[PDB]
Amino acid sequence: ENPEERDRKAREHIYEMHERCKKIKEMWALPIRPYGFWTFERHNAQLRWDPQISQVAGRRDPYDDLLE
Amino acid sequence: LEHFCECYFNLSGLILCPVLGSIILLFIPNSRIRLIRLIGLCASLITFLYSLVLWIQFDSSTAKFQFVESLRWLPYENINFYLGIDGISLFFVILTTFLIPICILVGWSGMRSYGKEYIIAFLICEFLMIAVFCMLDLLLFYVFFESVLIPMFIIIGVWGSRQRKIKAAYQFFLYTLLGSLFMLLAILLILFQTGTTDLQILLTTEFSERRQIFLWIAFFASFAVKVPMVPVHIWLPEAHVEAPTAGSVILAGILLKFGTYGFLRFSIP
Amino acid sequence: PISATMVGALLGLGTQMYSNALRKLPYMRHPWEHVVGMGLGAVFANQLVKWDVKLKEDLDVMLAKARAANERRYF
Amino acid sequence: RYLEEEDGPLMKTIKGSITGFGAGTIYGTILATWKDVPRVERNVALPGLIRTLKMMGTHGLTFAAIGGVYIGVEQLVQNFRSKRDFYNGAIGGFVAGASVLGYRARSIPTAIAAGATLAVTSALI
Amino acid sequence: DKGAIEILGPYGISYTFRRLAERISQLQSGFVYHYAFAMLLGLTLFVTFFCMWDSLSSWVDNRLSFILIVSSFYTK
Amino acid sequence: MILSVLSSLALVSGLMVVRAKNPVHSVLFFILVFCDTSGLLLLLGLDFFAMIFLVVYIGAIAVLFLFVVMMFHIQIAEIHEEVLRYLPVSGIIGLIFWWEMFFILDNESIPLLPTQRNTTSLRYTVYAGKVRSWTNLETLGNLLYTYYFVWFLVSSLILLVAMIGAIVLTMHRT
Amino acid sequence: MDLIKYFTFSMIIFILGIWGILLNRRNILIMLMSIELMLLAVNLNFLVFSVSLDDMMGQVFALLVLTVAAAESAIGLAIFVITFRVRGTIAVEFINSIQG
Amino acid sequence: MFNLFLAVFPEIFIINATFILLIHGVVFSTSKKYDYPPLASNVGWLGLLSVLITLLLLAAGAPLLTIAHLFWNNLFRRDNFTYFCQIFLLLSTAGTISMCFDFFDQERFDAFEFIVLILLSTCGMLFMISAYDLIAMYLAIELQSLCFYVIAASKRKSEFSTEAGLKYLILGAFSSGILLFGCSMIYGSTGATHFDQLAKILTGYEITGARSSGIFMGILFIAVGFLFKITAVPFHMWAPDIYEGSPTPVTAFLSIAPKISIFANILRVFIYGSYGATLQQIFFFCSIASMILGALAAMAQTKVKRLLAYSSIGHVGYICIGFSCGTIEGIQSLLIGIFIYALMTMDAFAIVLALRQTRVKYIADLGALAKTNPILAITFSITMFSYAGIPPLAGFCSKFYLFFAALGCGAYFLALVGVVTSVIGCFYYIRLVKRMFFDTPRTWILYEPMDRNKSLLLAMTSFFITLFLLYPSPLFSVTHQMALSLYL
Numbered sequence A: 001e002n003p004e005e006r007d008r009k010a011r012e013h014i015y016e017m018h019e020r021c022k023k024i025k026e027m028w029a030l031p032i033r034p035y036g037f038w039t040f041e042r043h044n045a046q047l048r049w050d051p052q053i054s055q056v057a058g059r060r061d062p063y064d065d066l067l068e
Numbered sequence B: 001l002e003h004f005c006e007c008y009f010n011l012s013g014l015i016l017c018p019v020l021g022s023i024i025l026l027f028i029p030n031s032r033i034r035l036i037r038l039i040g041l042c043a044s045l046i047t048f049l050y051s052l053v054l055w056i057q058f059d060s061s062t063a064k065f066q067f068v069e070s071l072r073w074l075p076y077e078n079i080n081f082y083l084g085i086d087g088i089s090l091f092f093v094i095l096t097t098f099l100i101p102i103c104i105l106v107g108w109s110g111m112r113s114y115g116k117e118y119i120i121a122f123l124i125c126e127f128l129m130i131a132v133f134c135m136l137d138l139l140l141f142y143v144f145f146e147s148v149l150i151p152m153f154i155i156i157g158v159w160g161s162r163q164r165k166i167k168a169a170y171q172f173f174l175y176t177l178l179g180s181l182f183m184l185l186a187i188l189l190i191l192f193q194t195g196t197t198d199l200q201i202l203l204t205t206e207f208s209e210r211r212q213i214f215l216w217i218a219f220f221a222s223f224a225v226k227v228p229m230v231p232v233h234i235w236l237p238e239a240h241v242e243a244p245t246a247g248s249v250i251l252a253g254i255l256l257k258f259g260t261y262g263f264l265r266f267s268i269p
Numbered sequence C: 001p002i003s004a005t006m007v008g009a010l011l012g013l014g015t016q017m018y019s020n021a022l023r024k025l026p027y028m029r030h031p032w033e034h035v036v037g038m039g040l041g042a043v044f045a046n047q048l049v050k051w052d053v054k055l056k057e058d059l060d061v062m063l064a065k066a067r068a069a070n071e072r073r074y075f
Numbered sequence D: 001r002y003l004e005e006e007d008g009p010l011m012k013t014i015k016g017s018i019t020g021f022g023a024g025t026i027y028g029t030i031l032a033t034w035k036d037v038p039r040v041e042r043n044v045a046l047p048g049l050i051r052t053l054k055m056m057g058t059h060g061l062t063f064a065a066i067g068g069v070y071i072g073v074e075q076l077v078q079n080f081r082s083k084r085d086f087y088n089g090a091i092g093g094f095v096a097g098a099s100v101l102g103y104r105a106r107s108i109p110t111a112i113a114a115g116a117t118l119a120v121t122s123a124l125i
Numbered sequence E: 001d002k003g004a005i006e007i008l009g010p011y012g013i014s015y016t017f018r019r020l021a022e023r024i025s026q027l028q029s030g031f032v033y034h035y036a037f038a039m040l041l042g043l044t045l046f047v048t049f050f051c052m053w054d055s056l057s058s059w060v061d062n063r064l065s066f067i068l069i070v071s072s073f074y075t076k
Numbered sequence F: 001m002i003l004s005v006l007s008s009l010a011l012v013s014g015l016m017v018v019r020a021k022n023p024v025h026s027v028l029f030f031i032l033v034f035c036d037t038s039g040l041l042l043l044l045g046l047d048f049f050a051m052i053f054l055v056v057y058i059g060a061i062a063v064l065f066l067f068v069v070m071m072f073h074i075q076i077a078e079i080h081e082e083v084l085r086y087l088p089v090s091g092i093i094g095l096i097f098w099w100e101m102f103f104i105l106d107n108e109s110i111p112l113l114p115t116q117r118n119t120t121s122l123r124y125t126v127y128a129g130k131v132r133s134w135t136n137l138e139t140l141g142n143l144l145y146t147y148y149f150v151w152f153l154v155s156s157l158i159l160l161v162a163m164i165g166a167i168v169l170t171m172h173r174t
Numbered sequence G: 001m002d003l004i005k006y007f008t009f010s011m012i013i014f015i016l017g018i019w020g021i022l023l024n025r026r027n028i029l030i031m032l033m034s035i036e037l038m039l040l041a042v043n044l045n046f047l048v049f050s051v052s053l054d055d056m057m058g059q060v061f062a063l064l065v066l067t068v069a070a071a072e073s074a075i076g077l078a079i080f081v082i083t084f085r086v087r088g089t090i091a092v093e094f095i096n097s098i099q100g
Numbered sequence H: 001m002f003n004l005f006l007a008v009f010p011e012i013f014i015i016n017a018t019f020i021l022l023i024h025g026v027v028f029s030t031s032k033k034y035d036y037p038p039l040a041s042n043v044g045w046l047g048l049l050s051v052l053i054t055l056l057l058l059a060a061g062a063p064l065l066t067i068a069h070l071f072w073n074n075l076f077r078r079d080n081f082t083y084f085c086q087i088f089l090l091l092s093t094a095g096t097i098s099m100c101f102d103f104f105d106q107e108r109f110d111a112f113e114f115i116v117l118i119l120l121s122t123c124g125m126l127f128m129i130s131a132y133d134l135i136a137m138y139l140a141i142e143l144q145s146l147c148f149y150v151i152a153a154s155k156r157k158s159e160f161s162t163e164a165g166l167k168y169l170i171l172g173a174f175s176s177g178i179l180l181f182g183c184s185m186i187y188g189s190t191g192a193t194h195f196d197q198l199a200k201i202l203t204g205y206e207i208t209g210a211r212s213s214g215i216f217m218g219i220l221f222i223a224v225g226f227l228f229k230i231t232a233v234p235f236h237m238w239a240p241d242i243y244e245g246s247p248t249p250v251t252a253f254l255s256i257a258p259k260i261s262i263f264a265n266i267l268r269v270f271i272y273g274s275y276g277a278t279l280q281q282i283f284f285f286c287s288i289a290s291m292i293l294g295a296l297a298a299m300a301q302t303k304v305k306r307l308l309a310y311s312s313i314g315h316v317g318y319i320c321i322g323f324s325c326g327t328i329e330g331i332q333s334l335l336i337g338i339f340i341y342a343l344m345t346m347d348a349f350a351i352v353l354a355l356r357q358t359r360v361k362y363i364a365d366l367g368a369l370a371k372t373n374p375i376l377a378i379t380f381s382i383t384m385f386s387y388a389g390i391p392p393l394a395g396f397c398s399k400f401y402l403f404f405a406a407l408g409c410g411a412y413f414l415a416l417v418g419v420v421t422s423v424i425g426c427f428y429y430i431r432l433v434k435r436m437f438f439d440t441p442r443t444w445i446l447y448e449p450m451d452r453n454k455s456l457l458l459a460m461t462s463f464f465i466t467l468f469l470l471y472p473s474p475l476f477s478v479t480h481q482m483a484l485s486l487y488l
């Protein structure tokens, strides 16, 4: 092989690997329990469903019948 | 980074030769004993000549790794693996390629009863051992060294002379696997610092004296079993005696060298 | 070169032969089945490659959302 | 990481003996319940209870012996030698294992094996 | 080579692990009562160690815990 | 006091379930336990569940147990054993369970100590909820078949499995 | 004190089931009966909590658990019947051949 | 209104098809005109078809399974995680069914109800995966369990099968009662059974001194039930006896699908909920106990089925190490381990079922197999080496992660235990290879060749086991996707 080119890809590997060694270690530090996951809309199902059944017999405030 | 070499004869084809021989032999009936014998012998001889050519184009002035080529594993390219040799590994590739045809020739007379399984096992051993000697990565060095245990186990157990081959094969497998697991622990220990297993990078990172001591102990656990060093040498007499002749040749001439190669290649530098 | 179609066709042919061998039958007992296996293997390999690309695409967005949720902590 | 205590080596040894006796009583209870009763005792209740209580007492005695001698020798090593490490406690584990389990097992190889095993455990700790 | 190293090696290791596997196999006694008793014991151990280990630390230590467990192997 | 009486009856009847030498007698005591449970349910105001415990536990399940145990004609030699040697193992397991599990509610649900003062006058009455009172039955039926109908249907699948299994394991057609 | 008294009632039923498992090593029919006792205790736990919490979820699940208890007893007694039919006896020494 | 039920199209179809097959089987099995034909294979083929159509409906309608999520919220929760879990469950059920036809016709097991019970248990496990409330989880678990109790006792004149059933029903019912007690304690302490509500109540407090002993013991009892289900030590001893005494197709089915379903449940209950370090310690200690006991007991075994049962116990220990460490990579590794163990178990039981045609029972019965069927002996050897975790076979992933987590969570006793148990496992796995290749017995057993179904399944699983590490990207990406979807 050509000694000049062989010795040059050798430099690109290291320069690229010393400065490339940071990206993957950031994923390993990602929290498994995200910040405020219960805030995520998928977890607030009852907050959006229950108002739709708030007038259903069986879960009404007793005074709602007296005024309606 | 694709590190593809420019030379025509490279490492990957020398890896592929005995693999292709094994696949072809998979499908040839055991009645065609002559064809099986000739195909195995010729594949091994072509691999030997290929290694001789690799010697010819060796450059004896550089401290770098020569004929370096790369093989991608994932499209993410976080983990990418390299093969390459130097002046410490070249002659071991040559010795492996030279010894394998000798093994096929030693069992020439008994091949009618040996079958194609004998030649296939030795060709697979050849492929795995050449890979081991040609790896610029701790993890792949691990993976391909452990792989030789399976065909070596089969070689000792099936074509050994007497029933002591049972105990010999068990002990060979278990001792070698224990050492290998120790060096797997060392590999993971290294990966946690560096985030990589590429040999070239590890040659340019600085390890603390303390963690150098402990990683060296973990490497020593594998290598001293491999060498062998006392008192973990007792598997060797049993295994090297009970194995068939060609099995003993491969065990003593190549497999024993893997511990000293590991000392030269990872532990000392 | 070494395309997914060729790897898949070889794997399908190998599957039919391996299946025949396991049943102690000649390698080429029902050759039209070997053709069928080559076709199915090629199809499966190509589909697997496409699915791998799509899987990486979805994982990218999902990691992006995870990163945004994590970065919301330092606000 | 360890500053929640009041210590006292004699208290350590006494409390270790008591804890060992409790653990041995529970262990003997479990062992006695696991086993079957002899065929000549199927129709009579009292001797089964007697044998269970005897097993309880024997195992409480031996486990109290280990749990006392262990801490006692451990403290008697770190007091005269006046040092804190895993070496103190490995000696105690060895002597406890050897002495008690070889008195019960009536063999020296068992004593050595038990002492060595008890040291590697306390060494890990 | 054929003496202490064999005893503190493949010969001794094979013997002890054979006896231990022997002992563990006998635990699977075939009696449904043993299997239920084991589940009850595991449940009791769970409650005892993981919730009723608050005031126990005054009289106990972790060292003695693990020692007595290993010591149980050398019984009878 | 009344809960003391019912709990004492349940305790004795349950001990008889687990300690009677004759299994037919065990089934009969089991029936006494379900009667006492129904009494507790009546104290809680759950008359539907009180009646259903009689209909299903005593009227159907216990009848099944009684039919099977009676036709077995078990001899005491096959199931006899002395239990005096279990008193310690039951003592530790019972006590640990007793100390932990009878008092688990005490820290979360602290009892109100009854004082020498009439707290009954502090009971506040809201007549709005009393205009149209719902029975236990209609409160349950408002929910089973509409808002939680999937669980209802899965229970049906469970019963279908029971029917199929009963046939496949025991049927010998003449 | 109502809630602690209702809970300890169900609790004694559960402990009695546990004891019935512990005390009946030669009598697996009573072992099945002890398991039903535990299931009854859990059912009672759901009903008491429903009242205490003023919530209906405890009551729906109680009904469904009754369905499960019924199916469980049916299948269990079928398995008992076929075991007896094969062996001619219910003694525990004839159901100990699987081991190790 | 009708479009709301698009969220349950897969389940509706499979239930209806199961009813159709029940009616078909009972109508024609009783037919004098047709001379009471055995219908186990006919119904089996139709049920395999039904499973595949269910898989098509589910996989091709991925967004539609999330339709009307508010309306369905108090009943179940479908997302990407449940999507992939259910697809894998259906694939496993299809493979297990395909492995049963030689058993049906050669043994003459004519009971078509076997297939119906398998399909109903698959329905139960589907509902298990999507369960998002303690009540729904319990009901689905019970449906699954009752189906297994019945099929474990299907050989109703066999001493072994009846013994298996009796032990299973008693121990299963006991564990279910314990789990239900835990559920009742949690409800009483929190007023909630929906997983979202439980997450909101329990998050941010764990054990903040004033810990709800009711919540803490409810979690413990539920964990005990879960550990029984995954056959974790010390709640394991039902598994070897049931696995050995049940009909071998039952044993194959029990070895795979319930693990997938219950691990989905465990992830969504614990991982998505909150008591915390206590429960990860539960699974940590049970993992260590399972690895040690599985290794030793498997080393003691002389019979194939018992060996595989103890092997599965050890491997669930390896898998639970991932749950214990409580990280995105831990969950991903648990999923990878489940997938690979399932494929390997399918391979192993395809071989076992093939060999059951000549009544294989003992390991020594494999003697001279490398002579009487060389390609079968090699295939079985690849499975064993994969079980041992020898690289580059697929089984190496679980070992690699076990040690990765041992040095990631910071646990060196765990690493030591892993090394020792891995070596013990390798010994008892290569003992089988020695029996097939090295031994020269005086009497040989000649085995009948396997059917096409098992040969094809074996051929595909054997290529996967040998070649997975050449192209492992899709599994890695899909498992990372699923691990993330649990919280986002």
Ligand SMILES: C[C@@H]1CC[C@@]2(OC1)O[C@H]1C[C@H]3[C@@H]4CC=C5C[C@@H](OCCC(CO[C@H]6O[C@H](CO)[C@@H](O[C@H]7O[C@H](CO)[C@@H](O)[C@H](O)[C@H]7O)[C@H](O)[C@H]6O)CO[C@H]6O[C@H](CO)[C@@H](O[C@H]7O[C@H](CO)[C@@H](O)[C@H](O)[C@H]7O)[C@H](O)[C@H]6O)CC[C@]5(C)[C@H]4CC[C@]3(C)[C@H]1[C@@H]2C
Pocket (backbone or CB within 6 Å): F001, F002, F035, F036, F038, F039, F040, F042, F043, F054, F114, F120, G001, G002
């Ligand atoms: C078909 C087949 C046949 C078989 C079968 O079915 C199947 O047949 C079926 C037939 C069933 C029986 C049917 C019927 C009963 C009666 C029931 O027993 C009622 C007991 C309840 C009602 O008792 C009172 O209720 C009211 C008072 O509460 C009285 O009202 C006054 O008071 C009002 C207010 O000022 C005024 O406004 C009114 O004007 C004024 O009249 C009312 O007259 C009187 O009835 C509960 O009472 C208690 O509960 C209290 C709370 O716990 C306890 O309080 C204590 O604890 C507190 C702290 O906690 C402390 O603060 C307290 O100081 C401290 O005392 C205390 O123990 C006690 O009061 C017990 C169950 C049983 C036997 C059933 C058994 C099972 C069966 C045999 C079935 C069987 C299975």
Ligand SMILES: CCCCCCCCCCCCCCCCCC(=O)O[C@@H](COC(=O)CCCCCCCCCCCCCCC)COP(=O)(O)OCC[N+](C)(C)C
Pocket (backbone or CB within 6 Å): B023, B026, B027, B116, B117, B118, B120, B121, B124, B128, B147, B148, B150, B151, B154, C010, C011, C013, C014, C015, C017, C018, C020, C021, C022, C024, C025, C026, C027, H373, H374, H375, H376, H378, H391, H392
């Ligand atoms: C390197 C990996 C790590 C280490 C693990 C090694 C594991 C193996 C252990 C090695 C030691 C020696 C092993 C010897 C095995 C070689 C012998 C062998 O397997 O031959 C089989 C061959 O087995 C096979 O069938 C293998 C098929 C696998 C297919 C894989 C190739 C995929 C692409 C190929 C496309 C088709 C062929 C193309 C050319 C025609 C013959 O099987 P029989 O049972 O003898 O007879 C079969 C019946 N009949 C001949 C009549 C059909």
Ligand SMILES: CCCCCCCCCCCCCCCCCC(=O)O[C@@H](COC(=O)CCCCCCCCCCCCCCC)COP(=O)(O)OC[C@H](O)CO
Pocket (backbone or CB within 6 Å): D109, D110, D112, D113, D116, D120, E007, E008, E009, E011, E012, E013, E015, E016, H416, H420
């Ligand atoms: C951790 C640092 C090292 C700690 C110290 C280790 C060295 C101390 C010795 C530890 C083992 C005690 C050896 C006891 C020797 C007597 C045992 C014996 O009786 O011989 C039997 C063999 O048993 C053994 O020798 C046991 C050998 C143990 C060696 C290693 C044990 C396992 C170690 C690996 C597991 C743990 C790995 C992790 C540890 C951190 C064979 O008996 P027989 O059938 O021949 O009958 C005749 C007999 O002589 C009676 O007269």
Ligand SMILES: CCCCCCCCCCCCCCCCCCCC(=O)O[C@H](COC(=O)CCCCCCCCCCCCCC)COP(=O)(O)OCCN
Pocket (backbone or CB within 6 Å): C032, C033, C035, C036
């Ligand atoms: C294009 C190449 C590939 C095309 C393959 C056919 C078209 C695809 C259709 C699906 C094919 C799937 C595989 C069919 C065979 C499956 C296994 C059947 C074997 C079996 O047990 O049943 C046999 C039925 O034969 C059968 O099932 C075969 C029946 C006739 C099909 C054979 C003709 C294939 C045509 C191939 C190219 C023809 C060129 C001209 C168009 C009876 O077996 P048996 O008693 O009949 O004898 C067998 C002598 N061992």
Ligand SMILES: CCCCCCCCCCCCCCCCCCCC(=O)O[C@H](COC(=O)CCCCCCCCCCCCCC)COP(=O)(O)OCCN
Pocket (backbone or CB within 6 Å): B167, B168, B170, B171, B174, B175, B178, B232, E008, E009, E010, E013, E014, E017, E018, H419, H420, H423, H424, H427, H431, H434
């Ligand atoms: C500072 C000083 C440090 C010194 C260096 C220490 C390093 C370790 C040195 C010891 C190395 C030990 C390696 C294990 C070799 C065991 C080989 C035994 C296998 C054998 O020959 O025969 C078997 C024994 O039986 C059996 O049943 C064997 C069971 C398998 C036992 C394998 C257990 C090894 C686990 C690792 C222990 C060491 C831990 C190190 C941290 C089969 O015989 P069979 O006839 O009964 O079988 C049925 C036959 N088909």
Ligand SMILES: CCCCCCCCCCCCCCCCCCCC(=O)O[C@H](COC(=O)CCCCCCCCCCCCCC)COP(=O)(O)OCCN
Pocket (backbone or CB within 6 Å): C011, C012, C015, C016, C033, C034, C036, C037, C038, C040, C041, C044, H091, H092, H094, H095, H096, H098, H101, H343, H346, H451, H452, H453, H454, H456, H457, H459, H460, H461, H463, H464
């Ligand atoms: C990934 C690694 C690399 C893998 C490579 C994959 C390549 C693709 C596969 C290529 C296949 C080559 C062979 C194709 C031709 C065979 C066509 C079969 C013809 C057929 O009708 O077979 C029938 C039986 O069904 C059957 O035998 C088929 C069912 C067998 C099971 C297949 C899977 C079904 C369930 C899915 C399980 C998934 C598991 C995942 C956990 C009847 O056959 P016959 O006529 O001979 O008479 C049998 C006596 N009754």
Ligand SMILES: COC1=C(OC)C(=O)C(C/C=C(\C)CC/C=C(\C)CC/C=C(/C)CC/C=C(\C)CCC=C(C)C)=C(C)C1=O
Pocket (backbone or CB within 6 Å): D030, D031, D034, D035, E023, E027, E037, E038, E039, E041, E042, H233, H234, H237, H285, H286, H287, H289, H293
């Ligand atoms: C060879 O000598 C002998 C023994 O000695 C091995 C014995 O025992 C016994 C009899 C007594 C026994 C078997 C009691 C032991 C029973 C227990 C501990 C119940 C639990 C069941 C099992 C299978 C153990 C599994 C639990 C483990 C490994 C740990 C628990 C869980 C975690 C740490 C998470 C006899 C007669 C004996 O002659």
